[PDB]
Amino acid sequence: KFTRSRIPDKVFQPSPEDHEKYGGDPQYPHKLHIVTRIKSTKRRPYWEKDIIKMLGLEKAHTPQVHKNIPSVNAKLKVVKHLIRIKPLKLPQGLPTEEDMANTCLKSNGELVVRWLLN
Amino acid sequence: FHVRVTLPPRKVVDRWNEKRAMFGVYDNIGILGNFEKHPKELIKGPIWLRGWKGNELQRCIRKKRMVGNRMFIDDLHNLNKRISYLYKHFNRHGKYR
Amino acid sequence: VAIWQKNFKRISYAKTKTRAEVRGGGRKPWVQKGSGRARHGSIRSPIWRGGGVAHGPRGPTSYYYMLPMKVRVQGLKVALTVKLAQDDLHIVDSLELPTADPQYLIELARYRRWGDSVLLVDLEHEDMPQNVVAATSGLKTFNLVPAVGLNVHSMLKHQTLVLTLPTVAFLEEKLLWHNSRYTPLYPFRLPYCDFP
Amino acid sequence: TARGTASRFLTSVLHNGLGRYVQQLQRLSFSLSRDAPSSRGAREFVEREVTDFARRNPGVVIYVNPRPCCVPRVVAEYLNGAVREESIHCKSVEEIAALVQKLAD
Amino acid sequence: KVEGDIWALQKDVEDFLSPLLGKTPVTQVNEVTGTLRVKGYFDQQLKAWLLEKGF
Amino acid sequence: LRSRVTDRYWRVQEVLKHARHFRGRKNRCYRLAVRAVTRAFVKCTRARRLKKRSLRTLWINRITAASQEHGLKYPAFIINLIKCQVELNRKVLADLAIYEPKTFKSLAALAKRRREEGFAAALGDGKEPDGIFSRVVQHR
Amino acid sequence: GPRALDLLRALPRVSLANLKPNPGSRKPERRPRGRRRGRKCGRGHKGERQRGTRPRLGFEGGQTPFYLRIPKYGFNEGHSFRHQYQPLSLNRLQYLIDLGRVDPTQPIDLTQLVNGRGVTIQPSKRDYGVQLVEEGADTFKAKVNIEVQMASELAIAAIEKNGGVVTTAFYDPRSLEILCKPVPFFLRGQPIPKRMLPPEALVPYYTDAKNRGYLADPARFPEARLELARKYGYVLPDITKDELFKMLSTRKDPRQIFFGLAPGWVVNMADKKILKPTDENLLKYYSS
Amino acid sequence: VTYFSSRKGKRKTVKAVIYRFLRLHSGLWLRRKAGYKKKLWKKTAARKRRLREFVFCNKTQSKLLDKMTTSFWKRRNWYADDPYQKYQDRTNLKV
RNA sequence: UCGGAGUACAAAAAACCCUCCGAGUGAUUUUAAUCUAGACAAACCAGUCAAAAUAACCAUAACAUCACUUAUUGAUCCAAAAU
RNA sequence: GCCUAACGAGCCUGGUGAUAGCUGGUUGUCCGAGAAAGAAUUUUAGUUCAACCUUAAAAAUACCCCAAAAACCCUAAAUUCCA
RNA sequence: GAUAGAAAUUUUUAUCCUGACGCUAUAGAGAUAGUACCGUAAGGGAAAGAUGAAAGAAUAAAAUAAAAGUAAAAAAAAGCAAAGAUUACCCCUUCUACCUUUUGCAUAAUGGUUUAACCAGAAAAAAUCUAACAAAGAGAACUUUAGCUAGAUACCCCGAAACCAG
Ligand SMILES: [Mg+2]
Ligand SMILES: [Mg+2]
Ligand SMILES: [Mg+2]
Ligand SMILES: [Mg+2]
Ligand SMILES: [Mg+2]
Ligand SMILES: [Mg+2]
Ligand SMILES: [Mg+2]
Ligand SMILES: [Mg+2]
Ligand SMILES: [Mg+2]
Ligand SMILES: [Mg+2]
Ligand SMILES: [Mg+2]
Ligand SMILES: [Mg+2]
Ligand SMILES: [Mg+2]
Ligand SMILES: [Mg+2]
Ligand SMILES: [Mg+2]
Ligand SMILES: [Mg+2]
Ligand SMILES: [Mg+2]
Ligand SMILES: [Mg+2]
Ligand SMILES: [Mg+2]
Ligand SMILES: [Mg+2]
Ligand SMILES: [Mg+2]
Ligand SMILES: [Mg+2]
Ligand SMILES: [Mg+2]
Ligand SMILES: [Mg+2]
Ligand SMILES: [Mg+2]
Ligand SMILES: [Mg+2]
Ligand SMILES: [Mg+2]
Ligand SMILES: [Mg+2]
Ligand SMILES: [Mg+2]
Ligand SMILES: [Mg+2]
Ligand SMILES: [Mg+2]
Ligand SMILES: [Mg+2]
Ligand SMILES: [Mg+2]
Ligand SMILES: [Mg+2]
Ligand SMILES: [Mg+2]
Ligand SMILES: [Mg+2]
Ligand SMILES: [Mg+2]
Ligand SMILES: [Mg+2]
Ligand SMILES: [Mg+2]
Ligand SMILES: [Mg+2]
Ligand SMILES: [Mg+2]
Ligand SMILES: [Mg+2]
Ligand SMILES: [Mg+2]
């Protein structure tokens, strides 16, 4: 039978080189995910279709942001072949309430707070 | 699909002719008339249909009961066959059961 | 109520012959197989030219139903109300006319701006003054009618309503009687305690 | 369909808007009924809007004919010689307004 | 059988019922029928409240 | 009350007018014509979608020609024009190629330059050189 | 009053030309024409159902039907012959008196209850009359002379406490019919029939003073009547010393339908006269 | 079921229903268990009891029996001495 | 038609003119009541458990047992019995 | 075999609009949602129940679900159940 | 079982106001006719009309010239016949007729030369929706622990071999 699939935890123990490679900090995990749906749910099992629905990933090539907490990481782990995950970065820091209109999200995965001054 | 080539004579109906102007006059005869005559009495028509209504089966059944013995042969026979057909149809055929 | 007035009287005599009532064609027009053509029973089937009608109207048909009393009463009340609110109701005394010339009536309605058509309601049939009967018998748009003949359809057909004064006293009572009334035990034509 | 019908190249009449812009709508003719219900919208339009419209567009003549008709029409007529017919039958005041604007532009 | 501004009656009814449900009760006003209609069974309390107002 | 369809004429005409220019009996007989017209419309919308691909392929062919003239293949020309932050869709590029042969030779020159710059930078193996045309501007 | 009226001045005449049925009143019917409702037209595909022939209602497809595998048991057994007593609570009786539909002044029997439309009897359904139930006992303050065809101890007590009188009387089906709708009976042009007796089953009910039966021995009445007052703990009033007492003692003959009329008379309602038989045989028959 | 009778043009009742079921006024139907008189020596005491019960029919059956039965059988009955009068109304049903 | 094992590897369910065993009852005495919360199972019909409470008995005394225990069975109507 | 060009039983009319779980057919436009089979059945060319689904309507939790938990010789992918 | 189905007992007010939300030549009667014609017989059973006030106005005068079929005018590489288009008809490019039936049809599975005219979803128990009045409602007969009354929403067409009577 084709079934769901366990994914042994050894997969998710990162090697020391990986930090260098994908550009994460060995010390501090990132706070937020940018998830994008790269592939299609057609031809995939219903349970993956549902996960993709409940992550707000319905529409392709649209970014969506999620907490980096384990509860979410479980679902992302299930559908990880359908998606692209990139850590959200805040060079200018979090937006205040004056900056809400001017926010924009750049493809390198970083959120710029002041967009197009004069 | 050819359509007539000439304008028909325009038919003028005057709405104020007697029958149209007086229409539905005594319909309230019961209420205003201290009930004596029910509006049924105003119905002109076949004896079995005055102040009564029903689907075709009920209609035929009733016609036969009332005027059946005054009917012509061919018409009575036709009426019977009609009844048998309607009986069979309504009772044994349909979608909804 | 207008719809009720229109339909409840109606009896359609329209009939069409089912394949059973057409004149002939008890026999199979040709043999079921081998002839090379389409198969048929009677030549009177609804497919065939002279044949019977598949559904079509059936028999004299009655459309008859009764709007419940209190509704038809409400109907009359509303018709009067609306005639009044729109300025087209005129309570008249009398009905005594100075003369039997209908032209008098026409020009009278022209002087008071009464509109094209007028419905004149009087208390009883025999008690109608003769001048009015004369005048209104030769008129198309003016219509004289007894109180028991008042109805929604006629009131909406004529632009202006003209009520005699005793007529108002009559209608008022007859119509109001229903707000306070019990449901009938047996028909109201029979003896009741207070009721005629 | 494209092979079914005629076609034309994109053009302007008299190189409009090159030197100066000339509103191409020349005249506008309404026909409605005072009595008939179908013309109801058209009547309201004649009351409220037409007047104002005529001031907004000084260069188009507007003829209004009450006549006994069942189907209110508006006939646009252009400098180009072109005549375009339209039916305002059974429409709002708003819809007629929009339509007349289309005709104007 | 409501003759008058029904909207007033709607105001008063939902203001009367609100402290009961913690929330404004759902309503339908039929202005032509002269009728008010309320989600839930409030019949007893409404009879009492209309009595108090002397109708 | 028997009701027949009186206006059947016009019902038919609204189909047949689309069929006039067909060959054969399709342009007359309502049966054949109805079918053919329906196929015509379907074919038409599908083609409405296709038309865009056709035109884009046309343009790419034309640009390919015009570039090959200057000794530059198509992919090279196009991506090295992108790497200059010159964004000109293919429609416009083809039109330049036909009606503005000079400006197009300029563009081709630009691209060839930028490409040579890229090779020079990949071969050089250092961060220091930035080719003049390889510099990346940000919005102001 | 109706501010709507004030708008009606502004608008054109209400005429036959503009009339709209209330929206939602007519759900428009749909016909099997067109792409949606055509081509098999809601009937499905082949089989017995598209052809219209699916079997009768209870038929399960040949397995022994549900409604026939269950065993027969008398439930509705002899139902047409059971006696049916339309209940009347003290609550409704009180509410009826309070609004002055029935008046407590004159004696209350079935006809009075019917005429107030406090109750409805249909003899055709084997209604044998009204039965009195105790629903409003605690709240019941009225003083009445009442006659019903059955009553419960608690109901009776509840009426006694207020100084009234209850009596249980029997009517046969024909009798009952006449009693509920008298005026249609008087247009019938027939004499007033004798009231039949109870059948053997109901005799022990109507012979007991327990039930204040109309056939009971009045010697027992005050005794049982007092027994009630012992049981429910209230002082039994002396009905004798009341001013309305003459009305309170009023009975019917066991053979008599109405109050003050007699078996065999004939009511001519157009002349407002009664007609009585002078014959010996007739008078022997009707008075037996 | 006959939907339109011949003589009266009305809708007949299927008596076979009236003999084995009982309709309360709430709309619940009540029936005996099947085989409750059959082969008793061969059965457990417990099972015997389970059989002796009066039980209720599920919705589907209830609608079926209603369709097979005319309006008369659904009227509110007041019988003297009736065992089942207690059960005709429904109480505290939150739905 | 009914049951046990495999097929169906670990909750349930799960087919074949698939692989294998069985059942259409004996033997015995502990002769195994009434009533009812709550559940299992289930298209329906049928099937299953079961506390408390009564009554029986030591005087605060309710599972018939064994044979792989699981299967040893049959609806309505209708007939015979009379409780 | 023959009985008026078709005789395993003539022809015609009537019963007759015979009856077909079988084949064929079933007529304007546009929009909202949308279905592959568990059970019985002289039943497997059909029905009637479930499960899904549609249209309204009332509600409150619904999927997803980490530990902990589910058998006795050996036994995998995995299930069940749940914050 | 499918189905069949009473009665006792109840109700019923005159005469005039007659016509048509019936058809208009494939409809409505089969009907111009039970004739022609077909059968030995019983029996079956058609189709068909259109000028005008006047044709005692035919060198005749007057308003459609619109179905398929043809003619005016045969064809010119290449392909479900069109569509995108195009200065340009073709030439280029892209699309495996339509119904039905099916697990699945371009299918070499079914049906249709074409045109016109005819030719097929019907019922109100429960329900929903709208409204009357409401512990009652219904113009008698019933139903009622918010109900009752009214309206509106619904269920096809052609076809056997047979069987029976005369
Ligand atoms: Mg025939
Ligand atoms: Mg025959
Ligand atoms: Mg052939
Ligand atoms: Mg036949
Ligand atoms: Mg005909
Ligand atoms: Mg697009
Ligand atoms: Mg329909
Ligand atoms: Mg369809
Ligand atoms: Mg079609
Ligand atoms: Mg089909
Ligand atoms: Mg099938
Ligand atoms: Mg009753
Ligand atoms: Mg379960
Ligand atoms: Mg115990
Ligand atoms: Mg022969
Ligand atoms: Mg058939
Ligand atoms: Mg079959
Ligand atoms: Mg699907
Ligand atoms: Mg069998
Ligand atoms: Mg189902
Ligand atoms: Mg777990
Ligand atoms: Mg949970
Ligand atoms: Mg049978
Ligand atoms: Mg003819
Ligand atoms: Mg003919
Ligand atoms: Mg032609
Ligand atoms: Mg080609
Ligand atoms: Mg096949
Ligand atoms: Mg299928
Ligand atoms: Mg294919
Ligand atoms: Mg093939
Ligand atoms: Mg071929
Ligand atoms: Mg094939
Ligand atoms: Mg073949
Ligand atoms: Mg083919
Ligand atoms: Mg076939
Ligand atoms: Mg075939
Ligand atoms: Mg076909
Ligand atoms: Mg063919
Ligand atoms: Mg109904
Ligand atoms: Mg439908
Ligand atoms: Mg036989
Ligand atoms: Mg047979």
From TrEMBL, chain A:
Sequence intervals crossing the membrane: none
GO cellular component labels: large ribosomal subunit; mitochondrial inner membrane
Q: Which GO terms describe its biological process?
A: translation
UniProt key word Ribosomal protein: yes
Q: Which UniProt keywords apply?
A: Mitochondrion, Ribonucleoprotein, Ribosomal protein, Transit peptide
MF (Gene Ontology):
structural constituent of ribosome
Q: What compartments host this protein?
A: Mitochondrion
Member of which family? Belongs to the universal ribosomal protein uL30 family.
Q: What's the name of the protein?
A: Large ribosomal subunit protein uL30m
Could you tell me which species this protein originates from?
Sus scrofa (Pig)
From TrEMBL, chain B:
Tell me, which GO biological process terms does this entry list? translation
Instruction: Say if the entry is tagged with keyword Iron.
Output: no
Q: What Gene Ontology cellular component terms go with this record?
A: mitochondrial large ribosomal subunit
The protein's location, in the record's own words, is: Mitochondrion
Alphabetically sorted, this entry's keywords are: Mitochondrion, Ribonucleoprotein, Ribosomal protein, Transit peptide
Signal peptide (residue range): none
Chief place where the protein resides: mitochondrion
GO terms (molecular function) for this protein are: structural constituent of ribosome
Family affiliation: Belongs to the mitochondrion-specific ribosomal protein mL51 family.
Protein name, as recorded: Large ribosomal subunit protein mL51
User: To which species is this protein native?
Assistant: Sus scrofa (Pig)
Its organism's taxonomic lineage begins at: Eukaryota, Metazoa, Chordata, Craniata, Vertebrata
TrEMBL record, chain C:
- For this entry, the protein name equals Large ribosomal subunit protein uL4m
Q: Name one GO cellular component term.
A: mitochondrial inner membrane
The record's similarity note reads: Belongs to the universal ribosomal protein uL4 family.
Task: Note the superkingdom of the native organism.
Answer: Eukaryota
Q: Name one GO molecular function term.
A: structural constituent of ribosome
Within the intact protein, the region shown is 99 to 248 of 272
Q: Where in the cell is it found?
A: Mitochondrion
Q: What is its main location?
A: mitochondrion
Keyword list, A-Z: Mitochondrion, Ribonucleoprotein, Ribosomal protein
Q: Which gene encodes it?
A: MRPL4
Automatic annotation (TrEMBL), chain D:
Q: What keywords does the record list, in alphabetical order?
A: Mitochondrion, Ribonucleoprotein, Ribosomal protein, Transit peptide
Indicate whether Lyase appears among the record's keywords. no
According to the UniProt record, one GO cellular component term is:
mitochondrial inner membrane
Which GO terms are recorded in the biological process aspect for this UniProt protein? mitochondrial translation
> What is its subcellular localisation?
Mitochondrion
What are the TM regions of this chain, as residue ranges? none
Q: In the record, what terms sit under GO molecular function?
A: structural constituent of ribosome
User: Is the keyword Ribosomal protein assigned to this protein?
Assistant: yes
UniProt lists the family membership as follows: Belongs to the mitochondrion-specific ribosomal protein mL43 family.
Record's protein name: Large ribosomal subunit protein mL43
Protein's organism: Sus scrofa
